[PDB]
Write a protein that binds this ligand. Structure first.
Ligand code: AGS
Ligand code: ADP
Ligand code: MG
Ligand code: MG
Lengths: 330, 355
């Protein structure tokens, strides 16, 4: 029943997945705001080089630096990290192989771009490796720098492979320190310190991808958090009236009667039009409920977010953060 | 605001290719399939190149299979034309491309290569490049008077026109032969790749470069793109009644205009036309009085008011597009009270498209 069991409050790494266009970026930002409230410090991470955080906050492209992007309720802070895969590869070459010289030569000929494109496993190793670094980082007092890390993650069709450390490591050079680090990544990912959240719309393909992704991840023994149902709409109709209206039956007499009380008399062509509008609404809610029912089989907590009327802006992220907090997200 | 006449464009056999463009999730696949179906009903021999039809729609067309080739869609005997359909098989189209240029013997090695199978075939822009290549295969076989082209989904509508060329230039990079298949800079890059990447993977990558033996890929993408400039090509931009989809449509209209490419118009899909003339302010008040006084009539009034507000946002979105593009013909398609996933629903969609 609860959309956020208490165990989810002990999670340090939140991965926000879901089909393309379902709300990952928006929801990951709203989640970060929710977790930062009350003097906390949360990192919002993106891994695909798409600059979705900059686009969402309507600012120029962010550099490879953890920077304050938002103020949360009661002195909380949200930092942003748009991972630059090229700078991450040079950082890796320098730290684990002392190849900073070779790396800076490669950047000048586009060879870092080539290498990350032709070796997808190296890409995931650098990305998941950086994610782990922000999670386990400590201050001078041996306390975590961040209270939580929220990853605006790859979509449902790619999330299981992105988190497949064994498969990513498979096509990398044997021996060295990269294999010792990967053990730490696996431990972190397969623990009570991580949770994968799945954003969905009440549409056929986003729901099918949600179910399919949960099954791949459960098989991988990766921890599932919540299913977040985005852009909910009001039914505005009672269950019996709705079920009837989805069949074309609307009680005109009862509608004509209630319109008299409200001081409204409608012509026949406009009254008929008003009735088919409610039939069309009822048909949409019914179809959405049939789609939603497919998620009932999952013994997974579920959260519901409303539809923002106009373009999602800064104020909208705070409304969605507030909606999450009301459902017990903390 | 000029009305788009899809019916006249479909009925006119001087229009040989109809490309359905825009962002993903706007109704491109269903628009392409509905246009192709109506053209067959007008007497034309049509093939529709679909990318990603939903399971039910692909079954309604008889294309739920692994084939990468058109098949006849059985229609009512009254239908004077013919409808043929296919769903793009991205991997199989890459195989066909490899064999056409490398030959059947060399292709046995390339297709068996693990780097080709896991990396080369899934690179950024492959879906757009393979759609263009398949279009090129359909045109060369001169078997249909009309080809209706569906385009891959993307947040960026220009990826259809840009991603094949971009993927071509990446495939033709000097870095392929020099870094995998000596210098000071190339040597430093090569040493770093040997040190970081797996020996097995580098051997597979090098074997792919040697086996393929390709400015091959960019030249192919250029020649195939030139087919979109042939006389008889029409572009149809599809957009939902959403700000992101409309912005993407406008970027596409600008590009077609800059490149002097023929645009039929805009399909403004999933609209909510008003069926009752009652004002929003009136409906809100009428529902507000009923709350403080049955209860069905107030919800009915709330449905209407919510639909009217939705219609209001769609009108202002369209007027912004139309203001910026007064030359572009437009056709508003209402959101239908059923899924467009069977031949009957394609026909109802095509009735909306051709009015
Ligand atoms: N609750 C909401 N209400 C209204 N609009 C929303 C809501 N959530 C997201 N959107 C909008 O829906 C669109 C898609 O949302 P995003 O957050 O960008 O999705 P996404 O899953 O990150 O998409 P990709 O995969 O990265 S293209 C954007 O235009 C958002 O502003
Ligand atoms: N006018 C319409 N009314 C109702 N449903 C529609 C309409 N146009 C498209 N749809 C539905 O919207 C979804 C997306 O359509 P599709 O053509 O597959 O989109 P795209 O190819 O642009 O991603 C499908 O389920 C389709 O049935
Ligand atoms: Mg995003
Ligand atoms: Mg499609």
């Amino acid at each position: 029943s609860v959309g956020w069991p208490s165990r989810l409050s002990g999670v340090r790494l939140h991965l926000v997945t879901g089909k393309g266009g379902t709300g990952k970026s928006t929801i990951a930002a709203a989640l970060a705001l929710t977790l930062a409230a009350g003097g906390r410090k949360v990192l919002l991470v993106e891994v695909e080089g798409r600059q979705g955080i900059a686009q969402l906050f309507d600012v120029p492209p962010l550099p490879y630096q953890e920077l304050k992007i938002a103020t949360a309720e009661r002195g909380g802070q949200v930092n942003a990290l748009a991972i630059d895969i090229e700078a991450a590869f040079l950082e890796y070459l320098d730290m684990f192989y002392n190849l900073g010289i070779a790396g800076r030569a490669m950047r000048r000929i586009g060879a870092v771009e080539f290498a990350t494109t032709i070796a997808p496993g190296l890409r995931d190793v650098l990305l998941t490796g950086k994610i782990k670094e922000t999670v386990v980082r400590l201050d001078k007092n041996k306390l975590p720098v961040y209270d939580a890390i929220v990853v605006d993650a790859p979509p449902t069709g790619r999330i299981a492979r992105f988190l497949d450390v064994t498969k990513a490591v498979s096509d990398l050079a044997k021996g060295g320190p990269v294999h010792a680090q990967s053990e730490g990544v696996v431990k972190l990912l397969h623990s009570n310190q991580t949770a994968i959240h799945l954003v969905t719309l009440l549409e056929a393909l986003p729901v099918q991808e949600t179910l399919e992704a949960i099954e791949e991840l459960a098989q991988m023994e990766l921890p599932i958090g919540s299913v977040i149902v985005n852009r909910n709409i009001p039914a505005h109709l009672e269950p019996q009236d709705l079920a009837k209206a989805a069949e074309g039956e609307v009680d005109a007499d009862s509608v004509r009667a209630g319109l008299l009380t409200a001081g409204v008399k409608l012509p026949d062509a406009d009254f008929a039009g008003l009735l088919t509008e409610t039939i069309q609404h009822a048909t949409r809610i019914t179809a959405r409920a049939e789609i939603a029912q497919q998620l009932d089989a999952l013994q997974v907590p579920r959260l519901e977010l409303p539809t923002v009327s106009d373009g999602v802006d800064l104020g909208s992220l705070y409304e969605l953060s507030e909606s999450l907090a009301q459902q017990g997200v903390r | 605001p000029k009305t788009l006449d899809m019916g006249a464009i479909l009925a006119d056999t001087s229009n040989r290719v109809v490309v359905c463009c825009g962002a993903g999730g706007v109704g491109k696949t269903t628009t392409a399939a509905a246009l192709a179906l109506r053209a067959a009903e007008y007497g034309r021999t049509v093939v529709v190149l679909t990318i990603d039809p939903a399971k039910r729609l692909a079954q309604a067309l008889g294309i739920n299979d692994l084939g990468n080739t058109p098949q006849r869609v059985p229609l009512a005997p009254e239908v004077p034309g013919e409808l043929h359909a296919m769903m793009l098989d991205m991997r199989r189209t890459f195989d066909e491309m490899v064999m056409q240029y490398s030959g059947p013997e060399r292709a046995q090695s390339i297709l068996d290569n693990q780097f080709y199978q896991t990396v080369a075939t899934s690179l950024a822009g492959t879906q757009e490049y393979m759609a263009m290549e398949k279009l090129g295969q359909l045109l060369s076989q001169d078997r249909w008077d009309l080809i209706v082209v569906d385009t891959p989904p993307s947040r960026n509508a220009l990826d259809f026109l840009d991603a094949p060329k971009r993927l071509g230039s990446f495939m033709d990079s000097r870095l392929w032969r020099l870094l995998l298949a000596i210098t000071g800079v190339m040597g430093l890059a090569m040493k770093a790749l040997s040190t970081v990447l797996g020996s097995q993977m580098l051997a597979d990558a090098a074997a792919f470069v040697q086996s393929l033996d390709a400015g091959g890929f960019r030249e192919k993408a250029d020649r195939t793109y030139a087919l979109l400039k042939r006389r008889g090509t029409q572009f149809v931009v599809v957009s939902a009644a959403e700000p992101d989809a409309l912005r993407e449509a406008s970027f596409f209209v600008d590009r077609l205009s800059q490149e002097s490419m023929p645009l039929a118009g805009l399909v403004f899909n999933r609209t909510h036309p008003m069926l009752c003339a009652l004002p929003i302010e009136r409906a809100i008040d009428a529902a507000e009085t009923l709350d403080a006084e049955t209860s069905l009539a107030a919800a009915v009034l709330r449905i209407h008011a919510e639909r009217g507000q939705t219609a209001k946002r769609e009108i202002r979105l369209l007027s912004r597009f139309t203001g910026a593009n007064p030359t572009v013909p437009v056709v508003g398609v209402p959101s239908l009270p059923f899924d467009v996933s069977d031949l009957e629903a394609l026909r109802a969609l095509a009735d909306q498209l051709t009015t």
